[PDB]
């Protein structure tokens, strides 16, 4: 073993001169021998410790027109790339720019050596990422995504993922070279799990970029990623889900989504907390202002599945904020919204939803829960149970808190949205006579009248609306007059908002 190293060390200087010789017959033979040397452990340690030999190998690979000489030098460099010290020699000898040129080779063996060596450098060699980028390696790797060897594609896509992570420039290059369509096509075509996994990781990295994200959606990546949501490989499923969640907010104009939504609803019952989390967040965005998707989600038992997720989640706002938001969406503005409002009750959802209004809930989850209750209150069968769970005193208490703040962004949420939301929910709960006795008995009429002076139009409308509902009973109509409500309601008659003026007239009539 030690005598092998001595023999190699002495041969190398002479082998170096022959390898960088004019005569290509000399060079071919020298390169074949250098490759044979690089297979044995002792003599390859000698090769990587000679900077001039490694340079000769790199120069010859760049320059040769002989196929056997391309294969041997590339194989030599590939053997050196399994060791830290060999990686450093390749880097220091301008071997990254050379290997990037070889990614354009028509010789498949050279291509396969070049990508695997480059993969080794990208994993283990400080500086290798900037060098590959600098050499224009990304444009070339993207062009290679139309090859059909699945193993070569798995390594190519992993090189793309390493290079794109945390680098805006590499994401845009990938996009400018047709990266999205090629990646999405791979997901639509192959079944090799290693390749699906690496490709899904590139798409995950591109899905946070705001130029790439729309491009992935247009190519059908939403539907392509959905195809693998029940694969036995968990790392594949989780990557597809993380990616779908990033893309979800730009996919609301998309169609042929029936299969994806169906599977997301089934995934809400996973015992994996990251799966449930992504399924909830994706569903919340895909139901947002999309009546077609809402109908499909309700039809496959989405309400039950979402209520069960809120019950399991507890004080986990990462899960409840999106789940509640999806329920909010499914309970308004489509054919089956009445059925959905009833369904939240029938599947044990009312007690748990009212509880989410209470601490330690934060303002994003409170804003959305208030909104869900507002929708649920459109269905008369929820009026009574919602009263029983304590929704009214708590909505009123949040309204006082948010209004007092607006005189004397908290947690991401504007306090005016909480005033509009809570009063809006009280506006609709006040359709029940029993609710009117609770609301009024909490000394709310003074504050509702003071809200008529609010500059924001949406708050005027909602405050006038709840005042309008309360006035239908006589004793309440007198307390509204006594609070000096006549003046501000008269000035609200001449409003550009049609609803504000309507409710304002209706209050004035019922005070006589």
């Amino acid at each position: 073993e030690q005598d092998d190293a001595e023999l190699a060390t002495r041969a190398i200087p002479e082998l170096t001169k022959l390898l960088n010789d004019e005569d290509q017959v000399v060079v071919n033979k020298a390169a074949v021998m250098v490759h044979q040397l690089s297979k044995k452990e002792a003599s390859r340690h000698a090769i990587m410790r000679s900077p001039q030999m490694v340079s000769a190998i790199v120069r010859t690979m760049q320059n040769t027109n002989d196929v056997e000489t391309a294969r041997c030098t590339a194989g030599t460099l590939h053997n050196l790339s399994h060791h830290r010290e060999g990686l450093l020699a390749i880097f220091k000898s301008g071997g990254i720019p050379a290997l990037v040129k070889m990614l354009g080779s028509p010789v498949d063996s050279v291509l396969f050596y070049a990508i695997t060596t480059l993969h080794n450098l990208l994993l283990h060699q400080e500086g290798a990422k900037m060098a590959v980028r600098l050499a224009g390696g990304l444009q070339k790797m993207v062009a290679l995504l139309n090859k059909t060897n699945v193993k070569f594609l798995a390594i190519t896509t992993d090189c793309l993922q390493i290079l794109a992570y945390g680098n805006q420039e590499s994401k845009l290059i990938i996009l400018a070279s047709g990266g999205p369509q090629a990646l999405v096509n791979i997901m639509r075509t192959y079944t090799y799990e290693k390749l699906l996994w690496t490709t899904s990781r590139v798409l995950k990295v591109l899905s946070v970029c705001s130029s790439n994200k729309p491009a992935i959606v247009e190519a059908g990546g939403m539907q392509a990623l959905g195809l693998h949501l029940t694969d036995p490989s968990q790392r594949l499923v989780q990557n597809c889900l993380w990616t779908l969640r990033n893309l979800s907010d730009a996919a609301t104009k998309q169609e042929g989504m029936e299969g994806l939504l169906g599977t997301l609803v089934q995934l809400l019952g996973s015992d994996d907390i990251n799966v449930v989390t992504c399924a909830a967040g994706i569903l919340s965005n895909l139901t947002c202002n999309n009546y077609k998707n809402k109908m499909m989600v309700c039809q496959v038992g989405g309400i039950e599945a979402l209520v069960r997720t809120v019950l399991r989640a507890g004080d986990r706002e990462d899960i409840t904020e999106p789940a509640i938001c999806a329920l909010r969406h499914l309970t308004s503005r489509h054919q089956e919204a009445e059925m959905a409002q009833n369904a939240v009750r029938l599947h044990y959802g009312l007690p748990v939803v009212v509880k989410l209004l209470h601490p330690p809930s934060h303002w994003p989850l409170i804003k959305a829960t208030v909104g869900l209750i507002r929708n649920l209150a459109l269905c008369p069968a929820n009026h009574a149970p919602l009263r029983e769970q304590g929704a009214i005193p708590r909505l009123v208490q949040l309204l006082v808190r948010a209004h007092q703040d607006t005189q004397r962004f908290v947690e991401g949420v504007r306090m005016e949205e909480i005033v509009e939301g809570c009063t809006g929910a009280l506006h609709i709960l006040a359709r029940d006579v029993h609710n009117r006795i609770v609301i009024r008995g909490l000394n709310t009429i003074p504050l509702f009248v003071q809200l008529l002076y609010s500059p924001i139009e949406n708050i005027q409308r909602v405050a006038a609306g709840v005042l309008c509902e309360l006035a239908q009973d006589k004793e309440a109509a007198e307390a509204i007059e006594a609070e000096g409500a006549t003046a501000p309601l008269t000035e609200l008659l001449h409003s550009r908002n049609e609803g504000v003026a309507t409710y304002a007239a209706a209050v004035l009539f019922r005070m006589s």
Binding site: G75, H78, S109, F112, Y113, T116, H119, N120, L123, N149, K151, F152, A154, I155, D158, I162, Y165, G166, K194, T198, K204, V205, V208, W242, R245, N246, S248, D249, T252, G281, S284, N285, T287, C288, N289, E321, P322, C325, R328, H329, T331, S332, R333, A337, A368, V370, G371, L372, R374, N375, L378, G421, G424
Partner: peptide
């Protein structure tokens, strides 16, 4: 009518982290 629908903006790149590939790489070149 009901409450306003709203998008939540998820922008998570995850983390970077290979050994399944070591087998792929050596199989591809032999």
């Amino acid at each position: 009518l009901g409450a306003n629908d709203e998008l939540i903006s998820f922008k998570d790149e995850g983390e970077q982290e290979e050994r399944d590939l070591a087998d792929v790489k050596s199989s591809l070149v032999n």
